[PDB]
Amino acid sequence: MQVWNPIDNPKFETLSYLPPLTDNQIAREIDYMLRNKWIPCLEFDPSGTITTLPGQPGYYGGRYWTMWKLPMFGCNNAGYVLREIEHCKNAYPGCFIRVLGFDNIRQVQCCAFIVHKP
Amino acid sequence: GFKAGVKDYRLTYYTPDYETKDTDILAAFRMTPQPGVPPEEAGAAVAAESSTGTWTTVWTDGLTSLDRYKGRCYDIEPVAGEENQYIAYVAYPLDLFEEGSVTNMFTSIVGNVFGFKALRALRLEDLRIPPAYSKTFQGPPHGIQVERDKLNKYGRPLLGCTIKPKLGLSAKNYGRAVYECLRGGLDFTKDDENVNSQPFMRWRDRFLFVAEAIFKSQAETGEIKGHYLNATAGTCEEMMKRAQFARELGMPIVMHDYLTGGFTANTTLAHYCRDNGLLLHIHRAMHAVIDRQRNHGIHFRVLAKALRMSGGDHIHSGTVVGKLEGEREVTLGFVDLLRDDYIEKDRSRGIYFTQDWVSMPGVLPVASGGIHVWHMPALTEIFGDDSVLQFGGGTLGHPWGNAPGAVANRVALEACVQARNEGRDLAREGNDIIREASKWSPELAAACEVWKEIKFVFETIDTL
Amino acid sequence: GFKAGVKDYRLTYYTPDYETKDTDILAAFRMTPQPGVPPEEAGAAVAAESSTGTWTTVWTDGLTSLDRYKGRCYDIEPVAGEENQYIAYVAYPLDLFEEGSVTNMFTSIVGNVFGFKALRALRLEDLRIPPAYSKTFQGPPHGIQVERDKLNKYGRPLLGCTIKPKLGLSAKNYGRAVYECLRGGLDFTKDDENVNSQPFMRWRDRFLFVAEAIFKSQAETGEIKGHYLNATAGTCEEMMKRAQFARELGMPIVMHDYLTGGFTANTTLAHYCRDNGLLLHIHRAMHAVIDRQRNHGIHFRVLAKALRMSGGDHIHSGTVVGKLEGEREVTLGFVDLLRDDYIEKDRSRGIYFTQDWVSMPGVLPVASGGIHVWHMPALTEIFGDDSVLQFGGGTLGHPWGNAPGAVANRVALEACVQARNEGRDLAREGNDIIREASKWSPELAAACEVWKEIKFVFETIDTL
Amino acid sequence: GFKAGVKDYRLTYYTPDYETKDTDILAAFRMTPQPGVPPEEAGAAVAAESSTGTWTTVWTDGLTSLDRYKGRCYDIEPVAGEENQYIAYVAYPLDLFEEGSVTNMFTSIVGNVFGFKALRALRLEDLRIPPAYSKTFQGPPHGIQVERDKLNKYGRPLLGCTIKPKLGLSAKNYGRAVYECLRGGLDFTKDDENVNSQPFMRWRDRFLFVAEAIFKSQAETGEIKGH
Amino acid sequence: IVGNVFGFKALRALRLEDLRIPPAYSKTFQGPPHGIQVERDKLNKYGRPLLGCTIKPKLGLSAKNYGRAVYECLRGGLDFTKDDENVNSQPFMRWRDRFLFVAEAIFKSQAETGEIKGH
Numbered sequence A: 001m002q003v004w005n006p007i008d009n010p011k012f013e014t015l016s017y018l019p020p021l022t023d024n025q026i027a028r029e030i031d032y033m034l035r036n037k038w039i040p041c042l043e044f045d046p047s048g049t050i051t052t053l054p055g056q057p058g059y060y061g062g063r064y065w066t067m068w069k070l071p072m073f074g075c076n077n078a079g080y081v082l083r084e085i086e087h088c089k090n091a092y093p094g095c096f097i098r099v100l101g102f103d104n105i106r107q108v109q110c111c112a113f114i115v116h117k118p
Numbered sequence B, C: 001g002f003k004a005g006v007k008d009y010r011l012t013y014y015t016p017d018y019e020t021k022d023t024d025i026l027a028a029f030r031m032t033p034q035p036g037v038p039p040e041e042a043g044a045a046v047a048a049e050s051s052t053g054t055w056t057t058v059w060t061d062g063l064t065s066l067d068r069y070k071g072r073c074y075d076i077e078p079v080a081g082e083e084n085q086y087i088a089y090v091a092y093p094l095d096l097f098e099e100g101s102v103t104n105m106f107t108s109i110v111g112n113v114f115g116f117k118a119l120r121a122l123r124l125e126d127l128r129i130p131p132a133y134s135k136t137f138q139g140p141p142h143g144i145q146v147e148r149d150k151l152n153k154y155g156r157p158l159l160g161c162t163i164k165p166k167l168g169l170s171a172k173n174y175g176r177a178v179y180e181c182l183r184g185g186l187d188f189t190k191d192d193e194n195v196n197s198q199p200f201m202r203w204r205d206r207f208l209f210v211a212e213a214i215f216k217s218q219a220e221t222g223e224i225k226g227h228y229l230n231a232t233a234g235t236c237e238e239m240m241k242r243a244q245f246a247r248e249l250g251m252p253i254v255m256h257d258y259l260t261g262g263f264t265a266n267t268t269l270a271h272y273c274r275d276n277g278l279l280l281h282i283h284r285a286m287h288a289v290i291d292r293q294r295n296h297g298i299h300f301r302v303l304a305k306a307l308r309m310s311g312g313d314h315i316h317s318g319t320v321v322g323k324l325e326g327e328r329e330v331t332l333g334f335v336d337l338l339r340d341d342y343i344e345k346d347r348s349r350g351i352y353f354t355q356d357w358v359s360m361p362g363v364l365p366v367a368s369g370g371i372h373v374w375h376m377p378a379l380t381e382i383f384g385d386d387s388v389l390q391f392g393g394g395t396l397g398h399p400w401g402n403a404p405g406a407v408a409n410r411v412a413l414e415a416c417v418q419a420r421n422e423g424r425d426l427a428r429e430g431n432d433i434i435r436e437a438s439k440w441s442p443e444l445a446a447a448c449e450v451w452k453e454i455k456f457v458f459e460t461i462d463t464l
Numbered sequence D: 001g002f003k004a005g006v007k008d009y010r011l012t013y014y015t016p017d018y019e020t021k022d023t024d025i026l027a028a029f030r031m032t033p034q035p036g037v038p039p040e041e042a043g044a045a046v047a048a049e050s051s052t053g054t055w056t057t058v059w060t061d062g063l064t065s066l067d068r069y070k071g072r073c074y075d076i077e078p079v080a081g082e083e084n085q086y087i088a089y090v091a092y093p094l095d096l097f098e099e100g101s102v103t104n105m106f107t108s109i110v111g112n113v114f115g116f117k118a119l120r121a122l123r124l125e126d127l128r129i130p131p132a133y134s135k136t137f138q139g140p141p142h143g144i145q146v147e148r149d150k151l152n153k154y155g156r157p158l159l160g161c162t163i164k165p166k167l168g169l170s171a172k173n174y175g176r177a178v179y180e181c182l183r184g185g186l187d188f189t190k191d192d193e194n195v196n197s198q199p200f201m202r203w204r205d206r207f208l209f210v211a212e213a214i215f216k217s218q219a220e221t222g223e224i225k226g227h
Numbered sequence E: 001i002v003g004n005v006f007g008f009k010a011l012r013a014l015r016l017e018d019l020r021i022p023p024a025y026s027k028t029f030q031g032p033p034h035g036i037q038v039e040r041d042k043l044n045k046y047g048r049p050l051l052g053c054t055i056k057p058k059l060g061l062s063a064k065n066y067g068r069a070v071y072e073c074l075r076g077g078l079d080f081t082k083d084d085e086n087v088n089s090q091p092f093m094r095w096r097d098r099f100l101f102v103a104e105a106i107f108k109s110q111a112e113t114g115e116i117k118g119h
């Protein structure tokens, strides 16, 4: 038998139970997004912690992050999206970075995963 | 004038040249007449005892207009492969129903016509609700998008589990198995249908112990967790006392059974969850007594179009591959009436009419019952990205415990959502995606051996 | 040890030499196994999947005593005339049920076992309730003895009528037709099942006119009269608002439906009626969807016992010579379970177990469904002196009006009651008693001619 | 792209080939354009500033579909006998309104478009309420038939009167003049618009004095009376 | 003052211009709840006029996107942020969750610049 380690083992949601992500695996998750006509975006924030309230159901803190420049309306190649992750990690090298994707017909998000850790 | 006597039904209730309006309700029956009765006398009798009329003539009918309050039959077609079965169509006006009540609609359609002495069988198949009638209801409290926004979860189907054995555990030991399962990587966990309040465990001693474990398990991984709390009772006062304690503790979701509690207590709870900001999970019990047989009862696609108008966020739907009966082409057909916004007629999937919901929120289907890891790349391909998957016996039966058993159901799931967005087929190659992932995770190879040839295959009863 | 794996059910859930206790609940099933399954493995799964058990083994079962909380099958016998049908018996402990709730029992017994892939049919027949469990319920509000004392009526059965057409009348015409019927000699008057509130007539307007019409006819003949008011709504706070007004106007009786409104909403109404001194009348709707077929569903004698514990005063039992199905030996069998206090086993009438009610009041059966004057000397011999007789279409169809139509019905009953306690036979004779009373009453000879050869004779489906 | 700037209204809000649905609300306006403005520009500007619109372009419009939330002008015709007056038609989608509220409906149509600098006049004429929207309201309490049935009066119109010293009467004198009018043969009697509560006559005793006379005037002729 | 006189058959126009309220009649009313000085004392703002903004497009946004655009505007230097005249409750967005999403953003935007903000 074996024991799961309960000390200092945080997780970060989707695709966080697999071996660490490498290049040519990030570029293939953006091609699948563009051929379904969705809009990419970027975000960053120093600390990923959450809080609560005494007696209010459905309320939590720490769900909003900062937007890099603006959503990219009209992107058609996976080069301009892979060249904007380097400018962000050279100006704020001590923060997290996460990638999104929007849909306007149903007004919901479709993807989210981390690409950098401090 | 007024003449006392007995006449036929066909002279008044059979008009096969009638054009339907846009504010009418339509229904379809599949009947079997009794020897010695014409097929056109049974269809008229079915429609002439659900709206107005009786077995003899009365004198009080001259004070009103009866050409704007009757039900009519306007089509008959025989079935293929039999000799004593037909299909009939009926139309009802709009001024016959009460706004905002579902228990009234059923009472006026399936009230008494099911026990006549001139028939041997009857079954209801479909219905058509006009848009002028759906606007008087409230609908689901939150819907689909508002539920995903609150929990901050996108990309993959959710996961859950239920606690076994069904009955016999204490109150402190019951809150200890929840923490182990929740710290492993699961999103939800669930009580059971028949656990309300019993001498071995009371209802106020379980809430506290569950709440204590949820907070402890939430601050260790850094994700939002939840738990369904059962709220069924035997009185409408005891039911509203158990839903006010969860609001005080700050819990996000509750549970109810809508077929044994009734169609009246469900609307009251749905009207309160909306005003206090909670989520509702619906369990379908005692549903096989009306369904299953193909020559008597009511289809499930009709029982599912009333829950949307009544109120609810989750609904059970069953699994095609499991220990309970189900069929693929019918499930794929009646799963589209729960999520979409405009469906079209299709007789290859059971749909008879055309339905639109004029911007009403949808519901999330749920699949559960007798499944394990080897069934994973067959459930992602059918349902899609909006479902809930529940493993009850596949988690607590792991040879190593509870926490190691939950790390095996998440790796086996995140490896299928990654091989799909690369251009690989999930049907032909399904035993090769859960054979390469079991080479870097020691907790999945230890589980791919206990259950390896356990399959359920049997004959089907309800053949389309 | 633990030894995770999959085993059979018969190894733990088949005890063919067990002695029942005095605090147990027993049930009888009738099943049709799927080809390729031993009979003993079929009856051992129903018990397992109803109290405790799943498809695999779990490690949490070692913390409790399992053979104190499990159900078991202790007898299997084959049916005569078939080759794939048997009867099974199951026993349940007492600590598995919540006190005072009927929903829990139905959720625990008929929850999920009805849709297994290894079976093709199933039907429940009977139950036995120990006296230690029925003492936690309240029971009927008033009963039989108190109602007769309050209404001051002894000697003969009661009478009633219902208004037709079902839908279409206004608020004032509906009220003016009650007075004519009441002044003729009847006792009660009934609304209709599908009449709650509609654009052509609202409830508060109809209540006032009915109340005004009741008073006028009471002071002219000098007898107590009443009328049933429907109190079915679509939400709970609307149902409890229509009873307070009826109490305020001083009306003595109300009405409800207990199969479409649900079990939870019925107990609250029963409690309110007990605490405010009203009377309750129960209408059975949507009951042929579960009954009728003899190889799937639930019998009515089981559905009748739950109503007694839940609460009520009147209940519909159906007729034998009407337009709806029914049999004599079964009706006579299950009337006793409603009226009596100690019933013994009898397989010629459908009873399997012995039942005693330890001094709980009974209920009054009701007969209806398409009878006329010629059927009177055959209905007084079956039921007896404790019943209610209703004529819906046989009163408003008389060739002379409403008031003359009630005298004909009233005279035909007091002539049969008088001829019984003199030594005459009501079965061989009965076409001669009426022809002699129709010689001094001109309002009965006019009715003995319109309906003279009207009968309903067909085959039977549920042959015992 | 985004391309921040200022553009016209006609390029987006003038579609004169549109087929109306059966769940839409329609309206008719009459307008007098300001010298130097084409009629179509004003017709399009009226619709834009009512549902979704402003004087410039914003970047938050790419996150939603704007072809299911806009109002359209689909017809313009000129009046006869003038030279600077026209009639316009507008259509609105169903899901822009709140069920069961009248205050919300008036706020979205006559809210702000009545004070533009490019117009000199405007008047609303008619509306078309679909049957799918009027079913969410309650309507009149009783109606007509339920009102005639309660009072037991058939055949002829009704009658009434109002006491007409508008202000200045006491309470007892006010109650006295009702009896002499009800005993004459009338059916109803009315207060006045500007009479609620004033230092010469409060309400709680006027009610009592009227109620006392109503009962007396009823038992002498044998008919139902009211006030 | 104006109930019926505006529709007489002997006139073709009418307009009201001004009124005079005696001091003996205005003392029976309550008046504004707070006023000017009390409002300024609570927010701790002196010297300059105030600033604000409103969200566009008027109708069509969801509940989370509505709350996202408020934080960005508030963290820039503004003081207030307004809803809209015809936004009460509609199928695309209800009120009980819009309130929560706005409240979550206000607290986050307030603790980063150290100034009082409202909406």
Ligand SMILES: O=C(O)[C@@](O)(COP(=O)(O)O)[C@H](O)[C@H](O)COP(=O)(O)O
Residues within 6 Å of the ligand: B162, B164, B284, B316, B317, B318, B319, B324, B368, B369, B370, B371, B390, B391, B392, B393, B394, C054, C055, C112
């Ligand atoms: O009670 C049970 O058996 C379950 O908790 C499954 O447990 P296991 O997974 O451990 O077997 C579910 O209620 C059934 O799936 C009911 O079926 P459904 O609601 O789909 O009809």
Ligand SMILES: O=C(O)[C@@](O)(COP(=O)(O)O)[C@H](O)[C@H](O)COP(=O)(O)O
Residues within 6 Å of the ligand: B054, B055, B112, C162, C164, C193, C284, C316, C317, C318, C319, C324, C368, C369, C370, C371, C390, C391, C392, C393, C394
């Ligand atoms: O039409 C009806 O529905 C009745 O009013 C009978 O009216 P008529 O006597 O005028 O035919 C009763 O409800 C039926 O007897 C119900 O059957 P049951 O209670 O036996 O299930």
Ligand SMILES: [Mg+2]
Residues within 6 Å of the ligand: B192, B193
């Ligand atoms: Mg279960």
Ligand SMILES: [Mg+2]
Residues within 6 Å of the ligand: C192, C193
């Ligand atoms: Mg009836």
Ligand SMILES: [Mg+2]
Residues within 6 Å of the ligand: D192, D193
């Ligand atoms: Mg006036």
Ligand SMILES: [Mg+2]
Residues within 6 Å of the ligand: E084, E085
């Ligand atoms: Mg504005």
